[PDB]
């Protein structure tokens, strides 16, 4: 009964276009395919905008005020969004490919490089109410005979330098009266002009060409005219200049060549500050901070993004996304981290809070098909089509063991015993499930009985039974542990594609080729429920199709499913453009999510293969925190979260219950009543107000008297709040009071409080321990220095 909304995209930090630093310099904006991602460098956080273009983004820009962001796709269609509120403001179609867009330093005007024409427009006022037609063109300039490479604003909002493919840099005046001031065309370069910039005084103009020549222009007597007083050359053996940027205040020139290396120069002296290489791929974009201390670089081929602090030669940000689609994903047991795997064969470990890759593993030769964690969480397992299964120790980030079959069987699915002592994998070519011992690495035995390829596996987290399904139209429950081995096959109407095990371990759900999600009781081995999914699934006609979408049957099933940790909902996805969230007990569709709206992607709407990228979801999972679910797709790891909680969802509300009455209860010191009333309203701000207003002396009295119905809610509130809050001791006092007061009740109902307790343990382990761990080491370090004999 929660509303999930798209929050951020992991696995991709830069696709193409231009990256822009925020005016404050604390945030970086990177176009990620069809959307824009914003990275909080100082706070080490990220989010992705919910708005979506028809096609891939081409040019973006944020005004100095930090209120308006403009994004333009490859078709010229623009979207204006309110940066502060993250809401789309207006859509306008420029009807031409805009190479670049830049706001004036005043912010009143912004300029467009459209073909060989410079268009200047007026910036809509954010404060004013929504306008039907807010965009008004200030002027259109037509001087160049070829496409404009880039444009640069003067510091005073009075002149613009435009560099084109005509081997010419040309200046204009924003004010018509000032046309006589700047109406000059600069020539002399032997290749395309990539960048023209003002000096800080604006007396000097620097122009940079693709061939690698920097011309310094000054207004001097031969009566007076612009002349090339000094000429500098980049003596790159074959690399061509790809992107150029200049910071007038610090006189820093950052240039990225096609060879994949960038140089920092001090103008006009041309002193090579530093030269580094990110790789063999071209450096598509370069950006500078407002202060000029941070340089952001971007390479489109491998999706690399680098934020470089040249003052201290330190890396604020250093990331690279998956080159291939993410075939699988796995959450850490506490939800702190998510592991993703790609068709390349490389595994990447991500941090949910920061959204950044902690480590990359390249041991697997071929595509990694599945990734799973042990119940303890320190160890992670992965299977690959190269014919190996590998165990990864994530505390030390090492592959401490590798498992393989006798005859190099390709593995597609994987399952790990809750005890972390047995590993099982399945294949599309063998029909047997290979079992290994984690400690020894030897083949215990091969589970036989399937007459088709094994499509999916799963261990029960509690009962430790193994459930396998196949294209044999059957499901088998294996009781491998114990003196005797039993197998209980269950028949199904069609091939089984995906399988999910209920967290309590008492039921298993399977998605079939007929588009059916069927739920079975494991102990009784009888069906208990069924859900239709064919009609809910949204599949678009491919551009190459010769048959209609409604008649099409390419993918009207779900290839991946997963239970919610409460057990009452299933999220499903497949080779289609829809992610459907159902409710198991009542078998209805809670909500459907459109995966992508990019028109380029095929499914959104004799020797040569007709192939283009398609929209498809490879794997889906619920976050163990019970606030989000991640879906691996072609573009990247989509994460939908319920964090915002703008909805009004009162619980057992009454006429007497009002936010004013709750505050009055605090004023009268009726802390228990105020807290209960706040929960009944279910407003986070009111709950937070009451939570922080309860004195330490009164906490044990309040905690012991909380009604049992609200206990799962308050524990969930504390765990989520405490992870990012600063009141570490205040939260620990609350947790101690609740656990001591309601410890027995939680034990009696473990499944009810499974998610709430897990969030609590994450706070006590991931933040609380690190504080005391550093506090204690100082204590012992202190004692040694004072107690020990000093050096000679």
């Amino acid at each position: 009964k929660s509303d999930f909304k798209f929050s951020n995209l992991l696995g991709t930090v830069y696709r193409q276009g231009n990256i822009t630093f925020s005016d404050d310099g604390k945030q970086l904006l990177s176009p990620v395919g069809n959307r824009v991602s914003v990275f909080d460098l100082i706070n080490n956080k990220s989010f992705t905008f919910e708005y979506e273009h028809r096609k891939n983004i081409a040019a973006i820009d944020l005004n100095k005020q930090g209120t308006l962001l403009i994004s333009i796709d490859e078709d010229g269609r623009a979207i204006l969004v309110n940066f502060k509120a993250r809401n789309v403001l207006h859509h306008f179609n420029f009807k031409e490919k805009c190479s670049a867009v830049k706001f004036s330093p005043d912010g009143r005007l912004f300029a467009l490089a459209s073909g060989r024409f410079l268009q200047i427009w007026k910036t809509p006022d954010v404060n004013k109410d929504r306008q039907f037609a807010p965009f008004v063109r200030h002027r259109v300039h037509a001087g160049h005979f070829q496409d404009i490479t880039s444009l640069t604003w003067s510091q005073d909002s009075r002149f613009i330098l435009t560099t084109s493919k005509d081997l010419s840099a040309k200046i204009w005046s924003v004010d018509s009266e000032e046309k006589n001031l700047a109406a000059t065309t600069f020539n002399g370069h032997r290749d395309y002009v990539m960048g023209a910039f003002f000096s800080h005084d604006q007396e000097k103009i620097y122009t940079v060409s693709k061939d690698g020549a920097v011309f310094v222009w000054e207004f001097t007597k031969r009566k007076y005219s612009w002349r090339i007083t000094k000429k500098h050359f980049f003596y790159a053996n074959q690399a061509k200049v790809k992107c150029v940027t200049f910071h007038p205040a610090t006189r820093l020139l950052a240039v990225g060549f096609t060879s994949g290396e960038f140089r920092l120069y001090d103008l006009p002296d041309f002193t090579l500050i530093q030269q580094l290489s990110m790789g063999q791929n071209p450096v598509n974009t370069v950006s500078v901070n407002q202060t000029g201390e941070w340089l952001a670089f971007g390479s489109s081929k491998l999706g690399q993004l680098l934020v470089y602090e040249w003052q201290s030669e330190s890396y604020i940000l250093k990331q690279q996304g998956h080159f291939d689609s993410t075939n699988s994903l796995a959450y850490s047991p506490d939800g702190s981290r998510v592991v993703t795997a790609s068709e390349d064969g490389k595994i990447k470990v991500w941090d949910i809070t920061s959204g950044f890759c902690l480590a990359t593993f390249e041991e697997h030769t071929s595509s990694v098909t599945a990734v799973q964690f042990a119940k303890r969480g320190q160890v992670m397992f992965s299977s690959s089509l190269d014919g190996t299964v590998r165990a990864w120790d994530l505390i030390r980030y090492r592959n401490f063991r590798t498992f393989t079959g006798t005859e190099r069987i390709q593995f597609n699915c994987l399952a790990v015993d809750p005890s972390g002592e047995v590993v099982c994998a399945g294949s599309l070519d063998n029909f047997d499930i290979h079992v290994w011992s984690v400690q020894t690495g030897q083949l215990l035995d091969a589970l036989s009985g399937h007459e088709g390829p094994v499509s999916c596996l799963s261990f029960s987290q509690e009962n430790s039974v193994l459930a396998s399904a196949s294209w044999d139209k059957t499901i088998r429950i294996w009781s491998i542990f114990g003196r005797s081995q039993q197998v209980e096959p269950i028949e199904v109407y069609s091939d089984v594609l995906a399988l999910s095990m209920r967290p309590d371990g008492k039921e298993v759900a399977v998605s079939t080729l007929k588009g059916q999600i069927s739920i079975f009781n494991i102990e009784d081995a009888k069906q208990v429920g069924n859900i239709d999914c064919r009609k809910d699934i949204i599949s678009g006609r491919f551009n190459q199709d010769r048959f209609t979408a409604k008649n099409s049957e390419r993918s009207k099933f779900f290839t991946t499913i997963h239970y919610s940790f409460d057990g009452m909902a299933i999220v499903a996805g497949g080779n289609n453009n829809s992610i459907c969230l159902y409710d198991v007990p009542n078998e209805v569709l809670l909500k459907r999510f459109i995966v992508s709206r990019n028109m380029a992607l095929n499914g959104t709407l004799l020797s040569t293969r007709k192939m283009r990228p398609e929209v498809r979801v490879t794997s889906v999972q619920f976050s163990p925190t019970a606030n989000a679910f991640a879906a691996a797709s072609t573009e990247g790891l989509l994460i939908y979260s319920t964090n915002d909680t703008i909805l009004f969802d009162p619980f057992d509300l009454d006429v007497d219950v009002t936010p004013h009455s709750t505050v009055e209860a605090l004023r009268e010191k009726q802390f228990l009543n105020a807290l209960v009333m706040a929960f009944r309203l279910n407003e986070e701000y009111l709950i937070n107000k009451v939570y922080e207003a309860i004195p330490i002396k009164e906490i044990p009295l309040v905690a012991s008297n909380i009604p049992a119905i609200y206990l799962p809610r308050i524990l969930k509130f504390i765990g989520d709040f405490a992870i990012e809050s600063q009141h570490i001791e205040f939260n620990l006092i609350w947790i101690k009071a609740l656990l001591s007061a309601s410890g027995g009740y939680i034990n009696e109902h473990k499944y009810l409080f499974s998610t709430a307790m897990r969030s609590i343990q994450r706070f006590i382990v991931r933040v609380a321990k690190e504080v005391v761990n550093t506090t204690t080491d100082n204590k012992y370090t202190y004692r040694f220095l004072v107690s020990t004999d000093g050096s000679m």
Partner: peptide, 16 residues
Amino acid sequence: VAPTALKDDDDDVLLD
């Protein structure tokens, strides 16, 4: 001025 405008030597000989 450009049309686009806005609006001791320490000796190196040291005794060794």
